Design a protein around this ligand. Structure first.
Ligand SMILES: O=C(c1ccco1)N1CCN(C(=O)C2CC2)CC1
Ligand SMILES: [Cl-]
Ligand SMILES: [Zn+2]
Ligand SMILES: [Zn+2]
Length: 567
C-alpha cells in the first residue's frame, strides 16, 4: 500500500512542510487520511432567456439556474461464486471486444490535437512547452519502473477527479484506444452505443423490442462509481492481457498505481487540504470512466441474465460443471444476449429471454450494483412498450411523416430542455460567444427536437436573432455547423439513416411532422396557454430586441419556414 502511494504523499508533504498537520478530528472513515496543509456557479444565457419569455414564470425552468456522503462508503467483498462468474465473464468479454480491434498506444500528437480543439496558464500552453514533456518522460520512466510520483487526484450524484495534464496524458497514452478506436461501438460490442447520436438510440431500442422475450428492464444503480469493487478493477485490468511490449507495461502501471491505489487532495472548510487514499471505487478520466463503466455494466447484466436463465444455482460457490456451463452459455449464446441490451456506461436497457430476470437479484446485489428507488429484494418493474423505456435521460416516440416514412425521435420533459439551454458555465463570455452558444442549443433543437412545437419555434427565433454566419460554440454533434439545418436534417434522418429505405429528400420544414398536440402537452409543451400564444404571435418583436442588443449585423428571418408565419 504505502509502498505505492508513499512517494506521492512524501512529495506533497514537502511542498507544504510549513503546514503539514495530522489532524485528529478528520471526517474520513472509509478513506485513509494521511495529513493536511494550508490552502463555479451556473450563469444565465441572456440570448436564450430573452427568446423564451413564457418560461420566466415556470419554476421547473427558473430554479435550474439557481444555487459527499456517498464517496465515504464501503462495498463488501463479493462471495466466491460471484467472483468466479465475474472473472469468467470478463475474460470472455475482453476476448470478444478484441476479436476485431488491436489495442495500441495513443500519441502526443493525438493528445496535442485534442487540447488544441478543446507554470503554464492553459493546456494549449503546456502541450507546446517541451519542459512539460520532459516531466511526462520522468513519470513515464517511473511507471515502467513500477512507481508513481505526480499522478494525484483532486476532488470537486456527481464527483469529478481532475489530475494535472501530464497524468491525463499517461492515462490517454495507455487506455485512450478504448474510446479513440470505438471498442464500445454497437458493431463491435453488440450492447454498446458509443458514437450513436440521440437520433440512433430510439431505433436501437425499437430493434431490441423486436426480440422475443420478456419486459424491457431499465434499472438505475444507486451511485454506480461508488459501487465499483477492487474485484471489478482487477477484471477491467485484464484488457492488458491483450497488449504487448511497452504498452502492456504502461497500461499495467495506470491500473496498479492510479486506479487500484488512489491519492486524492480534498478541500475541507474546517481550510486544510486533505490528502486521502483508497483502493476501490471509480476515479479515472471521464472518457476512460465511460468505457470501463460500459464494460463492467455489460458483464453484470450478462450475469443477471445467466441467473434468470438458471445457468448457476447459487453465488455462494460455483461447482466445476457450473463453470463449464457458464463458459458454454457464453460461447453458445453470449453474443445473442449482448444484442438484447443497450448499455451506455452505468445506464442499461435489457430485454431478457423472459421475466425470471425481474427476481434474479442475488448476483446483482452481491456484486454491489444495488438498484436505486426499490427495496433490495423487490422484483424489478419492467416496461411493456419500448416508447416508455427511459435511456440516456430520454424516451423515444414513433412519428409517421405525412408521406408514410417512420421517424423514431428522442424526447424529454420540455422544461428540462429549456432550463438547460438558459445556462452557461464559466466567466468572461462576450455577447457574441453567448449568442453562438444559444445558436448551438437552437440547432440541436432543430435536429433532435423538431417534433416539439415550442422548440421548433424557439430554435427558428434564436437562429433569426443571431447573425446568420456566426459559428455555433461549445454521441454525435451534427448541429455544430454553419450548413443549412434543412440540409443537415436530410443527411441525418434520411440519407445516412439505415432504418429509412426510401431516400427521397424533404424539400421544406413543413414536410417534417410534430408529435400529436396532446402528446406535446404531456411532454411539457405550453401550447394552449395564453402566454405561449402571445409569445408566438409577437415573436418578431423578441427577435428584434435581441438583434438591437447585438447590433447592425447580417441576419436571416427563419420564421416563414413555419406555416403560421408564411403570410
Ligand atoms: O391551442 C391553441 C393552438 C394553437 C395551435 C394549435 O393549438 N390555441 C390557439 C391559440 N390560442 C389563442 O390565441 C388564445 C388566446 C390564447 C389558444 C388556443
Ligand atoms: Cl409500459
Ligand atoms: Zn504516476
Ligand atoms: Zn416525449
Amino acid at each position: 500500500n504505502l509502498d505505492i502511494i508513499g512517494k506521492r504523499i512524501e512529495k506533497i508533504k514537502q511542498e507544504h512542510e510549513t503546514s503539514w498537520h495530522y489532524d485528529q478530528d478528520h471526517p474520513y472513515k472509509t478513506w485513509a487520511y494521511h495529513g493536511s496543509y494550508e490552502t463555479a456557479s451556473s450563469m444565465v444565457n441572456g440570448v436564450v432567456r430573452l427568446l423564451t419569455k413564457p418560461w420566466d414564470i415556470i419554476p421547473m425552468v427558473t430554479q435550474m439556474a439557481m444555487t459527499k456522503e456517498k464517496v465515504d462508503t464501503r462495498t463488501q467483498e463479493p462471495k466466491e461464486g460471484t467472483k468466479k462468474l465475474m472473472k469468467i465473464t470478463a475474460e470472455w468479454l475482453w476476448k470478444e471486444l478484441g476479436k476485431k480491434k488491436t489495442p495500441r498506444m495513443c500519441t502526443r500528437e493525438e493528445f496535442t490535437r485534442k487540447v488544441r480543439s478543446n507554470k503554464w496558464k492553459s493546456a494549449r500552453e503546456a502541450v507546446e512547452d517541451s519542459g512539460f514533456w520532459e516531466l511526462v518522460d520522468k513519470e513515464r520512466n517511473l511507471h515502467l519502473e513500477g512507481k508513481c510520483e505526480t499522478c494525484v487526484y483532486n476532488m470537486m450524484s456527481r464527483a469529478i477527479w481532475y489530475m494535472w495534464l501530464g497524468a491525463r496524458f499517461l492515462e490517454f497514452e495507455a487506455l485512450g484506444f478504448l474510446n479513440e478506436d470505438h471498442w464500445f461501438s454497437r458493431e463491435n460490442s453488440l450492447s454498446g452505443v458509443e458514437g450513436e447520436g440521440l437520433h440512433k438510440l430510439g431505433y436501437i431500442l425499437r430493434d431490441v423490442s423486436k426480440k422475443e422475450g420478456g419486459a424491457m428492464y431499465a434499472d438505475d444503480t444507486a451511485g454506480w462509481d461508488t459501487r465499483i469493487t477492487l474485484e471489478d478493477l482487477k477484471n477491467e485490468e485484464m484488457v492488458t492481457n491483450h497488449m504487448e511490449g511497452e504498452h502492456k507495461k504502461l497500461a499495467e502501471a495506470i491500473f496498479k498505481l492510479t486506479y487500484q491505489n488512489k491519492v486524492v487532495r480534498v478541500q475541507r472548510p474546517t481550510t486544510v487540504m486533505d490528502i486521502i487514499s483508497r483502493r476501490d471505487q471509480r476515479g479515472s478520466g471521464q472518457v476512460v470512466t465511460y468505457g470501463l463503466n460500459t464494460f463492467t455494466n455489460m458483464e453484470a447484466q450478462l450475469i443477471r441474465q445467466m441467473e434468470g436463465e438458471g445457468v448457476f444455482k447459487s453465488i455462494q460457490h460455483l461447482t466445476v460443471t457450473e463453470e463449464i456451463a457458464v463458459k458454454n452459455w457464453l460461447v453458445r449464446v453470449g453474443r445473442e444476449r449482448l444484442s438484447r441490451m443497450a448499455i451506455s456506461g452505468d445506464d442499461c436497457v435489457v430485454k431478457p429471454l423472459d421475466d425470471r430476470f425481474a427476481s434474479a437479484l442475488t448476483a446483482l446485489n452481491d456484486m454491489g450494483k444495488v438498484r436505486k428507488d426499490i427495496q433490495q429484494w423487490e422484483p424489478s418493474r419492467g416496461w411493456n412498450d419500448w416508447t416508455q423505456v427511459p435511456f440516456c435521460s430520454h424516451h423515444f416516440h414513433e412519428l409517421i411523416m405525412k408521406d408514410g416514412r417512420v421517424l423514431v425521435v428522442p424526447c424529454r420533459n420540455q422544461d428540462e430542455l429549456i432550463g438547460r439551454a438558459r445556462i452557461s458555465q464559466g466567466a468572461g463570455w462576450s455577447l457574441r460567444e453567448t449568442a453562438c452558444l444559444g445558436k448551438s442549443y437552437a440547432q440541436m433543437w432543430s435536429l433532435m427536437y423538431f417534433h416539439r412545437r415550442d422548440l421548433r419555434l424557439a430554435a427558428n427565433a434564436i437562429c433569426s436573432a443571431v447573425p446568420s454566419h456566426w459559428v455555433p460554440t461549445s454521441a454525435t454533434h451534427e448541429w455544430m455547423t454553419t450548413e443549412d439545418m434543412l440540409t443537415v436534417w436530410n443527411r441525418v434522418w434520411i440519407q445516412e439513416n439505415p432504418w429509412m429505405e426510401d431516400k427521397t429528400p424533404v424539400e421544406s420544414w413543413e414536410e417534417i411532422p410534430y408529435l400529436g398536440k396532446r402528446e406535446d402537452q404531456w411532454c411539457g409543451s405550453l401550447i394552449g396557454l395564453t402566454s405561449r400564444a402571445t409569445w408566438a404571435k409577437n415573436i418578431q418583436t423578441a427577435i428584434n430586441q435581441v438583434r438591437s442588443l447585438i447590433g447592425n449585423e447580417e441576419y436571416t428571418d427563419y420564421m416563414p419556414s413555419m406555416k403560421r408565419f408564411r403570410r
